[PDB]
Design a protein around this ligand. Structure first.
Ligand SMILES: *[C@@H]1O[C@H](CO)[C@@H](O[C@@H]2O[C@H](CO)[C@@H](O[C@@H]3O[C@H](CO)[C@@H](O)[C@H](O)[C@@H]3O)[C@H](O)[C@H]2NC(C)=O)[C@H](O)[C@H]1NC(C)=O
Ligand SMILES: *[C@@H]1O[C@H](CO)[C@@H](O[C@@H]2O[C@H](CO)[C@@H](O[C@@H]3O[C@H](CO)[C@@H](O)[C@H](O)[C@@H]3O)[C@H](O)[C@H]2NC(C)=O)[C@H](O)[C@H]1NC(C)=O
Ligand SMILES: *[C@@H]1O[C@H](CO)[C@@H](O[C@@H]2O[C@H](CO)[C@@H](O)[C@H](O)[C@H]2NC(C)=O)[C@H](O)[C@H]1NC(C)=O
Ligand SMILES: *[C@@H]1O[C@H](CO)[C@@H](O[C@@H]2O[C@H](CO)[C@@H](O)[C@H](O)[C@H]2NC(C)=O)[C@H](O)[C@H]1NC(C)=O
Ligand SMILES: *[C@@H]1O[C@H](CO)[C@@H](O[C@@H]2O[C@H](CO)[C@@H](O)[C@H](O)[C@H]2NC(C)=O)[C@H](O)[C@H]1NC(C)=O
Ligand SMILES: *[C@@H]1O[C@H](CO)[C@@H](O[C@@H]2O[C@H](CO)[C@@H](O)[C@H](O)[C@H]2NC(C)=O)[C@H](O)[C@H]1NC(C)=O
Ligand SMILES: *[C@@H]1O[C@H](CO)[C@@H](O[C@@H]2O[C@H](CO)[C@@H](O)[C@H](O)[C@H]2NC(C)=O)[C@H](O)[C@H]1NC(C)=O
Ligand SMILES: *[C@@H]1O[C@H](CO)[C@@H](O[C@@H]2O[C@H](CO)[C@@H](O)[C@H](O)[C@H]2NC(C)=O)[C@H](O)[C@H]1NC(C)=O
Ligand SMILES: *[C@@H]1O[C@H](CO)[C@@H](O[C@@H]2O[C@H](CO)[C@@H](O)[C@H](O)[C@H]2NC(C)=O)[C@H](O)[C@H]1NC(C)=O
Ligand SMILES: *[C@@H]1O[C@H](CO)[C@@H](O[C@@H]2O[C@H](CO)[C@@H](O)[C@H](O)[C@H]2NC(C)=O)[C@H](O)[C@H]1NC(C)=O
Ligand SMILES: *[C@@H]1O[C@H](CO)[C@@H](O)[C@H](O)[C@H]1NC(C)=O
Ligand SMILES: *[C@@H]1O[C@H](CO)[C@@H](O)[C@H](O)[C@H]1NC(C)=O
Ligand SMILES: *[C@@H]1O[C@H](CO)[C@@H](O)[C@H](O)[C@H]1NC(C)=O
Ligand SMILES: *[C@@H]1O[C@H](CO)[C@@H](O)[C@H](O)[C@H]1NC(C)=O
Lengths: 729, 729
């Protein structure tokens, strides 16, 4: 054996890059793929291409265009420059509209600088943008903007944008603007954070800054006042400069109004029908209101009969939040993913006039998501193939005959692709199946008309040839029967693996509620380096609390976080140790966020199975985390509700047992998700008891700690600790 | 040998304690020494004792009495309970006045809770206290308080108390109240921090606290607006309840009014004469105003003729601040320590009517301080004995015949005591000479009448016997001739030291301007453990910038901090290495505060002499430290004045060279002196360049990091790092 190993340098410097083919379906037959800084239009059926915009077009722009947005009409394009990131999704940027017919930059009534969000109408060239927490609408790109809201304020009234809590948990986005299917109406949400308490952390900026800046973010910790959401809808077609626009408010269902409620999701059904999903602060009761517009009163009305209530007594409602409904063209019938009586999520045909729901799919698998609803077929990704919870394959079901279900990707390349994803065209005429593993990522375009594979867009052939030279580690995904239940685990076995020889084992852990750490995706990460060079088996286990395996396993840790999942990881290590190739004296664990919470808990468990551990940005007490996430799985922190578990599930409590393990606590000073407070309290507890541990603070670094320099430094420091603890060279 | 060694446990658990005899001279013949929780009165001449207050007296108090204050009359006592510390000197506490004649606790008009400062009149039982930044005076302990100021405000107007900058630099205390010699007048200072910018750091309090508290302290960084000081004097004898008291303001000399000025010190001369020392922001010009009270106008007047101006073109005026004048009983003549033309500080007889000053002492030594001015003799401590800059001995000079100077402690116990300190009685009839080394601390009481040693109060005999069993390390203080100048150094040689054998060397460093690290004091510190058990020579060197050696050496680093002192420490290590008993391959350096700045600078020097280093609470850029300290030595951070050196003296700049040394950066999150910001910037710089280093943040810990738990953990972690770097067992 005389080949190079995957070194940390290769990982940090991204020497081996996984080519990807990302396209934008502008039509049912054409998509826009950016090549050599040139936007190109590709006919899906023929396969030919044409230059939509030459790089020279914006070479004289004078600014670096971060991203572009083609108007549905295709007569205009948005240019994003001066991109400034805020949180995971939130950002501010300047925008310049470019005419694609006159080949000229719009210079009059330009979108203002620091625009928080900008969106084209679903059809046409209307532009709605949020500036200074305020919503403006430009009916024509070259015409003056029309201001809709006037109550926008910073860290108080968010109009059209989402506050930290909603952006990171409820909507998973920074956009609260929902255009009507033809762009007649614009649905928006007004979040009020007047009462939500502020988390205050210090920012040191650059060396030039003399006095540090304090950053205050409206952040509702478990039990703290949550934000108030108010939904609104405005007729954009009636927008006038003479008078302000009028926004009709759709009130929440009375059940939600009794107490704190959340607007989980907003989905347009027809040009005059909208579906609002509300969920009470106690996330075990959710009502969907199919509201329609009444022409006579010009006001949207929600029929109590059409309302659909989904309650869960076993645990929380939804994997992370109520799913999205896929209405039919008529809009009087919709398909949604609901949990079956057995406890496995499946598609359920729904009619707006019948509260009864008819499940169209059933089994011990789980419908991961609905991709497209054509008048004849509904396409969904599922983990049914080979009963593998970590597999994703495309399936289509005849709407008229539900019994006729056909797999579309299961038997394409079974050896190389088992985790598939899909992006259909405007009318689902053509779809791009993208496989992420277990082999190299493969991107292929197919035609729904005859389910025929038109061509292969990307095959990662060059990377494959380069990876032949390096001694890449192998990945093993199997299951261990615990309490007569199959719990799957993945193991990145080192190259030239010998079962007889005993190798050190690092248990990468997350164990988040409804999370999967054992899948079939090819990933070039730090574990690849650890297994290839340091020869460390990197393993991950999905125990009670893991998702894609049913409500029973997912809702097992309900109202008891830091209990079953922590125990399962320790039991996993014991099973892994007795397999025969694991050095019992050298077993470690590492995790990020919830993984850090579990990593700390297992190290302080006093089990004696683990020797050392690295907790990065770890959660210490659940009363320091946001309300939406914590209250969903731990309930309210009140003396009459799980207050005991809230206090019994703190890492600080197990500090005395940390004296038997080596601990590395890494955290970013400017973390908005898991505040540095949580890491700080862990350190204080260990210092008080006298536990000796290593720590590393990264100044002005967020939860991701992904700044090139910090990313390299964090993994370099972690590599040193793991090697030192494992007594490796 | 079988003798045990001084272990870290002995140091952390204070196994060997140095007994001390601290007394309070209530009279010229009697002092109060607390024994077994009983205040006892001891006649100095006879040596007999009597119980002033039995422990039972305050056993039923119900609170823990932190400290006591006997009224000069002795008819009343103050009891301090509920002690809450703020900064180094600032604190808040509740006080209960106790009658020492009626043996009863005063229950009416009690001193309010959270009293910031309380002081008895110099003679009598008057009480002046500052509550809520406001000054109140109780003429009688059992009578209602009289409020003097009414403009007090938190973090804005400090009346009678010193702001952070003045408390930690100018006055080195939290008291701005100065009682007149017979208590007729009360001199006070009003500090205004309305413009001084606030340093904001986060406090994580306890595990219960859900949201961290942001602590904002008025702190003037180099160049930032400094606080405004206004002096005032009030006649307490005329205090009435019917009308408010009137405070006469003594304005600063015109020279100081031209720009920012500081009130360095306030010293009362007679019952009607006060001496104010003012210093401009540019600390190289100071004027002392001897102001007297004019009965006719009832206003204090400062004669321009009586003003004494001291300017220094070589460097800053004063060791750290203008010295304190010692006026004669008449008050028309005073003695002060001024630097001579040669550049060595010496006592200088002064007359209020003659601007000329006559030096009464001269030589290549330095008068450390004036202790007592009797009508016939002036007592001062100096480093003249054996030309040792680190020695302190008591001397007395006949005022009539200055040639007649007599040493009082030089030849008492030359082998055991060379560093002496003294506390005279009310009329200097008796004085307690306390020696801190080089042998065990020895406390003795003497009589000035015939300079006779009455008796020995404490001899640390028990500690001496216990220290016989342990293998205590030895201390060597010598000098290395650099550039034809004697630079002294101390070395804590390990037990059973063999010059032939090569031992590892750790250079404890501070190198602060006007600082001494090589002295003759016996200290049981971490170095004792390192030398006794780990067998590491701990050495300290006093190079350019050191004090007690003359203005030339002290003012050498003027307007150039981080230059000569850093180079000298590296040169010291080179000289130490070629001595013959130092392992060149294993030399390290550690420091706190300025020591941390030097430690970082020498590690990033690129010299290659040092292998590893530990910087605790280190200063990174001088533009982050307070103004009074930085501007005194580095000038103003302005483009026209030393702005370059300010940017050329940053640790972050030498980050690339840290790649050759092991670095441990320890800092407390809640540091008010060296803000964490300085450590944070160092870390960010190393992270950016890619320098691998270890770090450790101590949550809710101040500059001292002296909380029992943290103190033990910091030295434990530091011990591990030093041993690991020195490849020690
Ligand atoms: C966002 O939430 C805050 C807090 O609920 C809202 O502030 C509230 O605004 C109402 C407006 O009517 C205030 O009611 C009035 O208060 C005044 C005194 O301030 C009183 O004289 C009136 O009789 C009436 O009660 C309410 O007090 C106030 N609450 C506060 C300040 O805590 C705010 O309006 C909300 N913003 C939006 C756009 O929804
Ligand atoms: C402590 O320092 C601050 C800052 O110098 C002092 O505040 C100042 O107070 C004076 C009072 O006369 C203000 O002057 C007046 O201001 C008002 C507007 O606020 C204006 O209408 C008047 O004609 C006059 O100029 C001055 O502006 C103000 N400076 C500020 C607020 O920055 C404060 O009084 C000082 N405190 C003490 C007790 O010395
Ligand atoms: C790919 O080739 C086809 C022809 O085989 C193109 O289709 C025609 O393109 C011409 C271009 O001038 C049009 O005038 C015709 O109307 C098109 N015919 C149809 C049926 O659409 C197609 O446009 C090409 N695609 C690209 C991206 O160049
Ligand atoms: C549209 O609404 C805005 C906001 O209320 C109006 O602008 C305000 O008009 C009032 C009139 O008294 C002023 O006091 C405010 O200062 C204005 N601005 C704001 C931000 O409140 C505007 O006039 C309305 N337009 C029409 C035609 O009704
Ligand atoms: C977009 O959709 C809206 C809602 O259906 C359309 O508005 C209605 O259009 C019909 C047909 O012209 C009218 O009879 C209704 O009175 C309209 N309702 C309202 C609220 O005005 C709108 O015309 C559609 N736009 C386009 C271009 O098709
Ligand atoms: C949603 O969760 C709450 C909190 O667990 C449930 O309220 C409890 O209901 C049970 C009976 O089912 C009572 O014994 C408890 O005392 C209630 N409160 C608490 C604090 O547990 C509520 O019933 C749940 N709702 C649904 C639809 O399951
Ligand atoms: C130490 O002893 C001396 C006597 O040798 C004490 O002096 C006398 O003490 C009595 C006590 O009742 C007084 O009445 C006398 O007036 C004292 N004489 C003088 C000259 O002072 C002295 O008080 C004793 N000291 C202590 C602390 O008990
Ligand atoms: C002593 O000074 C205080 C402070 O100025 C006086 O108390 C104030 O009196 C005014 C009279 O109009 C009130 O408006 C204030 O509210 C009072 N308090 C404060 C804190 O300002 C007090 O009256 C004065 N006493 C005498 C006898 O003059
Ligand atoms: C404390 O000292 C002050 C200042 O010397 C004395 O006040 C003066 O006392 C003399 C003598 O009685 C008077 O002639 C002056 O008019 C007083 N000046 C003022 C400002 O009142 C005061 O008497 C001394 N107190 C005691 C008890 O000796
Ligand atoms: C106090 O220090 C300041 C700053 O160094 C001195 O001002 C400088 O004086 C020199 C001459 O001695 C000039 O060449 C400089 O231009 C002055 N300004 C600066 C920015 O350096 C001042 O003279 C000193 N005062 C005394 C009494 O020594
Ligand atoms: C711009 O596009 C042309 C298209 O032929 C390509 O050759 C050229 O390399 C591109 N330049 C950049 C900087 O991408
Ligand atoms: C954005 O800022 C730049 C720079 O000040 C300015 O030239 C431009 O006109 C601004 N755009 C808008 C729409 O305000
Ligand atoms: C209180 O004082 C008496 C004086 O004889 C002493 O015996 C006793 O030990 C003291 N108690 C404490 C707790 O110091
Ligand atoms: C201080 O507070 C305690 C507790 O409330 C109270 O008993 C006491 O009287 C207070 N003292 C004064 C002087 O206010």
């Amino acid at each position: 054996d005389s080949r190079k190993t995957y070194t940390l340098t290769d990982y940090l410097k991204n020497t081996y890059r996984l080519k990807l083919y990302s396209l934008r379906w502008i039509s049912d037959h054409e998509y826009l793929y950016k090549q050599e800084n040139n936007i190109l239009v590709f006919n899906a059926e023929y396969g030919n291409s044409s230059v939509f915009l030459e790089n020279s077009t914006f070479d004289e722009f004078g600014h670096s265009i971060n991203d572009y947005s083609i108007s549905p009409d295709g007569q205009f394009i948005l240019l994003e420059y001066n991109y400034v990131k805020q949180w995971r999704h939130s950002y501010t940027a300047s925008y310049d509209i470019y005419d694609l017919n006159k080949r000229q930059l719009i210079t009059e009534e330009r979108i203002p600088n620091n625009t928080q969000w900008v969106t084209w109408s679903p059809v046409g060239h209307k532009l709605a943008y949020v500036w200074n927490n305020d919503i403006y609408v430009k009916i024509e790109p070259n015409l003056p903007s029309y201001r809709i809201t006037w109550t926008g304020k910073e860290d108080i009234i968010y109009n059209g944008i989402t506050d930290w809590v909603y952006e990171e948990e409820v909507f998973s986005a920074y956009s609260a603007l929902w255009w009507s299917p033809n762009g007649t109406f614009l649905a928006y949400a007004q979040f009020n954070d007047t009462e939500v308490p502020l988390i205050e952390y210090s920012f040191y900026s650059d060396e030039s800054l003399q006095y540090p800046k304090t950053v205050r973010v409206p952040y509702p910790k478990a039990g703290a006042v949550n934000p108030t959401v108010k939904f609104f809808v405005v007729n954009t077609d009636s927008l006038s400069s003479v008078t302000n626009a009028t926004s009709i408010q759709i009130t929440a269902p009375a059940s939600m109004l009794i107490g704190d409620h959340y607007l989980c999701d907003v989905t347009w059904a027809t040009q005059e029908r909208i579906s609002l999903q509300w969920l009470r602060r106690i996330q075990n009761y959710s009502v969907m209101d199919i509201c329609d517009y009444d022409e006579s009163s010009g006001r949207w009305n929600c029929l109590v009969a059409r309302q659909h209530i989904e309650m869960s007594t076993t645990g929380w409602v939804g994997r992370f939040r109520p799913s999205e409904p896929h209405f039919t063209l008529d809009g009087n019938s919709f398909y949604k993913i609901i949990s079956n009586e057995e406890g496995y999520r499946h598609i359920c045909y729904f009619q707006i006039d019948k509260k009864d729901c008819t499940f169209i799919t059933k089994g011990t698998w789980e419908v991961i998501g609905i991709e497209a609803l054509t008048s004849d077929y509904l396409y969904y990704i599922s983990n049914e193939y080979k009963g593998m919870p970590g597999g994703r394959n495309l399936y289509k079901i005849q709407l008229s005959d539900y019994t006729k279900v056909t797999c579309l990707s299961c038997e394409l390349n079974p050896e190389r692709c088992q985790y598939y994803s899909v992006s259909f065209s405007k009318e689902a005429k053509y779809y791009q199946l993208r496989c992420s593993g277990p082999g190299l990522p493969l991107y292929t375009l197919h035609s729904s008309v005859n389910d025929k594979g038109l061509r292969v867009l990307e095959d990662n052939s060059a990377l494959d040839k380069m990876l032949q030279n390096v001694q890449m580690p192998s990945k093993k995904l199997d299951f261990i029967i615990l309490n007569e239940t199959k719990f799957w685990y993945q193991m990145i076995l080192p190259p030239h693996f010998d079962k007889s020889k005993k190798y050190p084992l690092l248990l990468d852990v997350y164990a988040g509620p409804c999370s999967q750490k054992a899948d079939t995706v090819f990933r070039l990460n730090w574990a690849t380096y650890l297994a290839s060079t340091e020869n460390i088996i990197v393993a991950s286990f999905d125990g009670r609390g893991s998702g894609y395996q049913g409500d029973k396993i997912m809702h097992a840790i309900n109202r008891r976080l830091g209990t079953f999942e922590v125990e399962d990881q320790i039991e996993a290590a014991r099973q892994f140790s007795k397999m025969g190739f694991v050095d019992n004296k050298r077993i470690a664990i590492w995790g990020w966020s919830y993984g850090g919470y579990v990593t700390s808990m297992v190290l302080g468990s006093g089990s004696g199975v683990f020797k050392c551990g690295i907790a990065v940005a770890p959660v210490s007490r659940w009363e320091y985390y946001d309300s939406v996430y914590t209250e969903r799985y731990m309930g309210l922190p009140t003396p009459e509700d799980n207050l005991d578990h809230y206090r019994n599930s703190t890492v600080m409590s197990r500090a005395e047992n940390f004296k038997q393990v080596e601990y590395l606590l890494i955290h970013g000073t400017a973390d908005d998700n898991v505040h540095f407070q949580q890491s700080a309290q862990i350190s204080k507890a260990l210092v008080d008891v006298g536990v000796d541990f290593q720590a590393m603070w990264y100044t002005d670094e967020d939860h991701g700690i992904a700044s090139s320099t910090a990313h390299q430094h964090i993994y370099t420091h972690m590599s040193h600790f793991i090697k030192q603890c494992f007594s490796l060279p």
